[PDB]
Amino acid sequence: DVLPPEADSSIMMLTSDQKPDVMYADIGGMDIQKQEVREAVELPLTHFELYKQIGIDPPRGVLMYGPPGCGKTMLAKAVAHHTTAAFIRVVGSEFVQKYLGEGPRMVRDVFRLAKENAPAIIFIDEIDAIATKRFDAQTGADREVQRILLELLNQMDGFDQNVNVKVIMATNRADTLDPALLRPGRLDRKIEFPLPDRRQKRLIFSTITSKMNLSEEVDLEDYVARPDKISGADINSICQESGMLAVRENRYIVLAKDFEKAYKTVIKKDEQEHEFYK
């Protein structure tokens, strides 16, 4: 007799009911990334027939890149509170084991619980691990699990079409990803995380200042101007550093002084008088 389904094996499913951390009200800066992701995730998941009406085949391919800043998993935590679906949280390296015979069953199990519990969303973090090519026998199991990445690449062809799956993907470095993965027909969407900008500066300052105590002396004009001459950044974590320089004290509410201090702490370097060209 066969598996019910689905009793696994491994991972497992669920574990996400007592989670996630916070809703999507946190990150309000992007707004151009969410319009892509929301339309590429929750809309195809809610109405499958609406796409068939207009005659457009909704892709399952979601690609993210650009860090820093981090972006990425924050969106997974948001979409977790938007819709009720089954979420897979797995580390790129988590399935690699001592025996290659477990790989194919594992990816198959992920997918078969996905189709049984559909609607469902699967998130693997930084698959660029298994995207690198090697020929040795010791990496021969790594080659087998990248042919397993190709085997799930075949299984998602099994998902074509209609019911069902959702695959979101992120990586710190996209230069190591093989063109077969980014090829259209499987991942049709490439979303790049942009560097924070002025519009995003004021949003990234509002969101951190709501959670932490603020002072009337503290003004965001010079903080959206002077750091905007270079950064860039990471800006949020420097505001967190203003919290961490308030917790260096012995302080009631943070003032302008600690912010100005967090700038000169971490990090800037010059680098260079050679820049005297401009």
Binding site: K133, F135, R143, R147, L150, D178, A180
Partner: protein, 50 residues
């Protein structure tokens, strides 16, 4: 109606065809096995790389 064959191809064209070699021969042995066949250069067309 002839078969369509692309050049490398990554990674997995090398493993599927032999272990290791000139790589232009064993592949050509597959094209000899199935004829007619068309060979295509895919792709390495980029500004990278310019």
């Amino acid at each position: 109606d002839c078969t369509f064959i692309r050049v490398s191809g990554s990674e997995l064209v090398q493993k599927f065809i032999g272990e290791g070699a000139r790589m232009v021969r064993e592949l050509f042995v597959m094209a000899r096995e199935h004829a007619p066949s068309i060979i295509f250069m895919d792709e390495i067309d980029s500004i990278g790389s310019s």
